[PDB]
Amino acid sequence: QQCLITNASNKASGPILRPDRPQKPFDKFFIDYIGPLPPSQGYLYVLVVVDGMTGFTWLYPTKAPSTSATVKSLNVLTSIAIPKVIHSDQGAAFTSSTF
DNA sequence: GCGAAATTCCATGACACTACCTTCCCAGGAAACAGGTTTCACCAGCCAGGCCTTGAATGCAATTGTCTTACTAGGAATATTTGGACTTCCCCACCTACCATTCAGGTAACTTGATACAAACACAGCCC
């Protein structure tokens, strides 16, 4: 067990999966902060909410990727309509028990 | 010819300079703190009477402010003379960076120990 946890596999994973598109908009949002960018107006982080139906991006810049900076960023966007599913990454701000 | 065994094959992944940074979690405990209740005693607020200190008015005395003159020394310019700070070049010892080893201290605990505070009665010093 000194040689099992250092050598890496020479066996690639198989074919990638293409999951199907949803059949309506407002079904899957794919959200991920970008940044730290170069600063402007006291902003560094930009929430990016892509619709999984189309590609229709939504931008909601914030000061710092906290939980509450995301929550008010979607209250603008939940004013439009309500999604069923929101995908993300396992972010520092999304995995919080508050969010 | 099947199976067992000895061998060659080939598709692939990771190495490329790396740590911080942010936000949320966890956590245990604790930090007190912010919050709040409770009660007793005390310090602050209240008001007036008497006296002393301050303010003012003053007269005057010397203190101080101005004027004037003879002058001493300061400053500047000089030459020079002299006294040194820093730039320079080089080497060694000393500080550091390191690991291993160990000792000492801080926390911590249980005990002990000792002193200060709170209370009471009296004494002495100073003042009215």
mmCIF file of all heavy atoms in Angstrom, chain A residues 40-61:
data_model
loop_
_atom_site.group_PDB
_atom_site.id
_atom_site.type_symbol
_atom_site.label_atom_id
_atom_site.label_comp_id
_atom_site.label_asym_id
_atom_site.label_seq_id
_atom_site.Cartn_x
_atom_site.Cartn_y
_atom_site.Cartn_z
ATOM 1 N N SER A 40 -13.852 47.007 -10.784
ATOM 2 C CA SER A 40 -14.558 48.170 -11.302
ATOM 3 C C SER A 40 -15.781 48.367 -10.417
ATOM 4 O O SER A 40 -16.491 47.400 -10.132
ATOM 5 C CB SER A 40 -14.965 47.986 -12.754
ATOM 6 O OG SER A 40 -15.750 49.077 -13.191
ATOM 7 N N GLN A 41 -15.989 49.604 -9.956
ATOM 8 C CA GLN A 41 -17.115 50.022 -9.121
ATOM 9 C C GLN A 41 -17.246 49.220 -7.835
ATOM 10 O O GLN A 41 -18.342 49.121 -7.279
ATOM 11 C CB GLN A 41 -18.438 49.962 -9.888
ATOM 12 C CG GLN A 41 -18.549 50.987 -10.973
ATOM 13 C CD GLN A 41 -18.569 52.375 -10.416
ATOM 14 O OE1 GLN A 41 -17.617 53.136 -10.577
ATOM 15 N NE2 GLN A 41 -19.652 52.719 -9.738
ATOM 16 N N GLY A 42 -16.156 48.646 -7.342
ATOM 17 C CA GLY A 42 -16.246 47.765 -6.203
ATOM 18 C C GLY A 42 -16.840 46.414 -6.511
ATOM 19 O O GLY A 42 -17.427 45.796 -5.622
ATOM 20 N N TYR A 43 -16.718 45.939 -7.744
ATOM 21 C CA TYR A 43 -17.221 44.625 -8.103
ATOM 22 C C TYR A 43 -16.077 43.744 -8.583
ATOM 23 O O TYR A 43 -15.151 44.224 -9.242
ATOM 24 C CB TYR A 43 -18.295 44.754 -9.175
ATOM 25 C CG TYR A 43 -19.579 45.359 -8.658
ATOM 26 C CD1 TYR A 43 -19.821 46.715 -8.755
ATOM 27 C CD2 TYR A 43 -20.539 44.568 -8.058
ATOM 28 C CE1 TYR A 43 -20.995 47.262 -8.278
ATOM 29 C CE2 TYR A 43 -21.710 45.104 -7.581
ATOM 30 C CZ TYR A 43 -21.933 46.448 -7.695
ATOM 31 O OH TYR A 43 -23.103 46.974 -7.216
ATOM 32 N N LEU A 44 -16.119 42.462 -8.212
ATOM 33 C CA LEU A 44 -15.111 41.490 -8.622
ATOM 34 C C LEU A 44 -15.699 40.187 -9.121
ATOM 35 O O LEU A 44 -15.066 39.496 -9.920
ATOM 36 C CB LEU A 44 -14.170 41.171 -7.465
ATOM 37 C CG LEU A 44 -13.241 42.294 -7.038
ATOM 38 C CD1 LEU A 44 -12.480 41.899 -5.799
ATOM 39 C CD2 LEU A 44 -12.303 42.562 -8.161
ATOM 40 N N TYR A 45 -16.892 39.842 -8.665
ATOM 41 C CA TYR A 45 -17.505 38.548 -8.909
ATOM 42 C C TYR A 45 -18.806 38.738 -9.667
ATOM 43 O O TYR A 45 -19.605 39.611 -9.323
ATOM 44 C CB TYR A 45 -17.759 37.835 -7.585
ATOM 45 C CG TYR A 45 -16.508 37.303 -6.934
ATOM 46 C CD1 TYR A 45 -15.701 38.126 -6.165
ATOM 47 C CD2 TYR A 45 -16.097 35.997 -7.142
ATOM 48 C CE1 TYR A 45 -14.543 37.650 -5.587
ATOM 49 C CE2 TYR A 45 -14.948 35.511 -6.565
ATOM 50 C CZ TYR A 45 -14.181 36.342 -5.786
ATOM 51 O OH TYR A 45 -13.031 35.874 -5.206
ATOM 52 N N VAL A 46 -19.020 37.922 -10.698
ATOM 53 C CA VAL A 46 -20.197 38.013 -11.558
ATOM 54 C C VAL A 46 -20.904 36.670 -11.566
ATOM 55 O O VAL A 46 -20.387 35.701 -12.133
ATOM 56 C CB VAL A 46 -19.834 38.416 -12.986
ATOM 57 C CG1 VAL A 46 -21.066 38.436 -13.832
ATOM 58 C CG2 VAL A 46 -19.197 39.739 -12.993
ATOM 59 N N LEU A 47 -22.073 36.603 -10.945
ATOM 60 C CA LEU A 47 -22.920 35.432 -11.097
ATOM 61 C C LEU A 47 -23.410 35.351 -12.533
ATOM 62 O O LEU A 47 -23.791 36.360 -13.125
ATOM 63 C CB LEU A 47 -24.092 35.494 -10.125
ATOM 64 C CG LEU A 47 -25.163 34.414 -10.227
ATOM 65 C CD1 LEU A 47 -24.562 33.069 -10.079
ATOM 66 C CD2 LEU A 47 -26.187 34.603 -9.148
ATOM 67 N N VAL A 48 -23.350 34.155 -13.111
ATOM 68 C CA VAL A 48 -23.719 33.912 -14.500
ATOM 69 C C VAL A 48 -24.761 32.811 -14.499
ATOM 70 O O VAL A 48 -24.453 31.667 -14.159
ATOM 71 C CB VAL A 48 -22.518 33.507 -15.358
ATOM 72 C CG1 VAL A 48 -22.975 33.143 -16.729
ATOM 73 C CG2 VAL A 48 -21.525 34.623 -15.426
ATOM 74 N N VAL A 49 -25.980 33.137 -14.887
ATOM 75 C CA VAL A 49 -27.080 32.184 -14.857
ATOM 76 C C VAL A 49 -27.449 31.877 -16.303
ATOM 77 O O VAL A 49 -28.164 32.646 -16.954
ATOM 78 C CB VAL A 49 -28.279 32.728 -14.079
ATOM 79 C CG1 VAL A 49 -29.365 31.673 -13.980
ATOM 80 C CG2 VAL A 49 -27.844 33.204 -12.712
ATOM 81 N N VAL A 50 -26.964 30.754 -16.814
ATOM 82 C CA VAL A 50 -27.259 30.324 -18.174
ATOM 83 C C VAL A 50 -28.501 29.449 -18.135
ATOM 84 O O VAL A 50 -28.614 28.565 -17.282
ATOM 85 C CB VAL A 50 -26.073 29.553 -18.765
ATOM 86 C CG1 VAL A 50 -26.352 29.128 -20.187
ATOM 87 C CG2 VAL A 50 -24.824 30.375 -18.671
ATOM 88 N N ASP A 51 -29.446 29.702 -19.034
ATOM 89 C CA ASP A 51 -30.552 28.772 -19.184
ATOM 90 C C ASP A 51 -30.062 27.527 -19.911
ATOM 91 O O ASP A 51 -29.267 27.600 -20.850
ATOM 92 C CB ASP A 51 -31.716 29.412 -19.945
ATOM 93 C CG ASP A 51 -33.006 28.601 -19.845
ATOM 94 O OD1 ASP A 51 -33.033 27.572 -19.136
ATOM 95 O OD2 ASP A 51 -34.004 28.983 -20.488
ATOM 96 N N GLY A 52 -30.536 26.372 -19.453
ATOM 97 C CA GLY A 52 -30.136 25.122 -20.072
ATOM 98 C C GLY A 52 -30.949 24.818 -21.310
ATOM 99 O O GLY A 52 -30.601 23.935 -22.096
ATOM 100 N N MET A 53 -32.056 25.530 -21.483
ATOM 101 C CA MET A 53 -32.845 25.394 -22.696
ATOM 102 C C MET A 53 -32.129 25.989 -23.895
ATOM 103 O O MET A 53 -31.964 25.325 -24.922
ATOM 104 C CB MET A 53 -34.189 26.081 -22.512
ATOM 105 C CG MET A 53 -35.095 25.949 -23.694
ATOM 106 S SD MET A 53 -35.582 24.248 -23.926
ATOM 107 C CE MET A 53 -35.744 24.212 -25.701
ATOM 108 N N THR A 54 -31.695 27.241 -23.776
ATOM 109 C CA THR A 54 -31.237 28.019 -24.918
ATOM 110 C C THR A 54 -29.750 28.337 -24.847
ATOM 111 O O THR A 54 -28.994 27.978 -25.750
ATOM 112 C CB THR A 54 -32.025 29.324 -24.986
ATOM 113 O OG1 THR A 54 -31.685 30.123 -23.852
ATOM 114 C CG2 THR A 54 -33.503 29.051 -24.936
ATOM 115 N N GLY A 55 -29.315 28.988 -23.780
ATOM 116 C CA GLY A 55 -28.049 29.684 -23.759
ATOM 117 C C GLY A 55 -28.212 31.143 -23.400
ATOM 118 O O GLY A 55 -27.247 31.910 -23.490
ATOM 119 N N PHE A 56 -29.416 31.534 -22.991
ATOM 120 C CA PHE A 56 -29.744 32.913 -22.642
ATOM 121 C C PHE A 56 -29.090 33.247 -21.310
ATOM 122 O O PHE A 56 -29.596 32.869 -20.251
ATOM 123 C CB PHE A 56 -31.254 33.086 -22.551
ATOM 124 C CG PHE A 56 -31.698 34.505 -22.416
ATOM 125 C CD1 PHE A 56 -31.888 35.286 -23.534
ATOM 126 C CD2 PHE A 56 -31.923 35.063 -21.171
ATOM 127 C CE1 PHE A 56 -32.310 36.585 -23.411
ATOM 128 C CE2 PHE A 56 -32.329 36.362 -21.052
ATOM 129 C CZ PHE A 56 -32.515 37.120 -22.171
ATOM 130 N N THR A 57 -27.977 33.966 -21.352
ATOM 131 C CA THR A 57 -27.235 34.253 -20.136
ATOM 132 C C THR A 57 -27.897 35.369 -19.336
ATOM 133 O O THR A 57 -28.597 36.223 -19.882
ATOM 134 C CB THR A 57 -25.805 34.635 -20.483
ATOM 135 O OG1 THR A 57 -25.818 35.859 -21.217
ATOM 136 C CG2 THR A 57 -25.204 33.576 -21.370
ATOM 137 N N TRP A 58 -27.693 35.337 -18.023
ATOM 138 C CA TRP A 58 -28.084 36.420 -17.129
ATOM 139 C C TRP A 58 -26.917 36.766 -16.222
ATOM 140 O O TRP A 58 -26.300 35.873 -15.637
ATOM 141 C CB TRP A 58 -29.282 36.061 -16.254
ATOM 142 C CG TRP A 58 -30.589 36.050 -16.913
ATOM 143 C CD1 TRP A 58 -31.303 37.130 -17.303
ATOM 144 C CD2 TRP A 58 -31.424 34.914 -17.131
ATOM 145 N NE1 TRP A 58 -32.510 36.739 -17.818
ATOM 146 C CE2 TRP A 58 -32.605 35.377 -17.727
ATOM 147 C CE3 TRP A 58 -31.272 33.545 -16.913
ATOM 148 C CZ2 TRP A 58 -33.639 34.523 -18.094
ATOM 149 C CZ3 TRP A 58 -32.295 32.696 -17.289
ATOM 150 C CH2 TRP A 58 -33.461 33.189 -17.871
ATOM 151 N N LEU A 59 -26.644 38.056 -16.070
ATOM 152 C CA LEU A 59 -25.516 38.532 -15.288
ATOM 153 C C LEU A 59 -26.010 39.315 -14.083
ATOM 154 O O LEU A 59 -26.931 40.123 -14.198
ATOM 155 C CB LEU A 59 -24.624 39.412 -16.144
ATOM 156 C CG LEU A 59 -24.161 38.669 -17.382
ATOM 157 C CD1 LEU A 59 -23.386 39.575 -18.279
ATOM 158 C CD2 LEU A 59 -23.324 37.512 -16.973
ATOM 159 N N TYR A 60 -25.397 39.084 -12.928
ATOM 160 C CA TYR A 60 -25.766 39.789 -11.704
ATOM 161 C C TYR A 60 -24.525 39.997 -10.858
ATOM 162 O O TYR A 60 -24.258 39.233 -9.924
ATOM 163 C CB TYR A 60 -26.822 39.023 -10.913
ATOM 164 C CG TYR A 60 -28.138 38.894 -11.608
ATOM 165 C CD1 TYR A 60 -28.575 37.673 -12.085
ATOM 166 C CD2 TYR A 60 -28.962 39.991 -11.758
ATOM 167 C CE1 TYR A 60 -29.789 37.554 -12.712
ATOM 168 C CE2 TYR A 60 -30.168 39.887 -12.392
ATOM 169 C CZ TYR A 60 -30.588 38.668 -12.859
ATOM 170 O OH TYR A 60 -31.803 38.590 -13.488
ATOM 171 N N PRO A 61 -23.748 41.040 -11.145
ATOM 172 C CA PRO A 61 -22.470 41.237 -10.447
ATOM 173 C C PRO A 61 -22.642 41.592 -8.978
ATOM 174 O O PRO A 61 -23.617 42.228 -8.578
ATOM 175 C CB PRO A 61 -21.828 42.389 -11.219
ATOM 176 C CG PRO A 61 -22.970 43.093 -11.822
ATOM 177 C CD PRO A 61 -23.976 42.065 -12.168
#
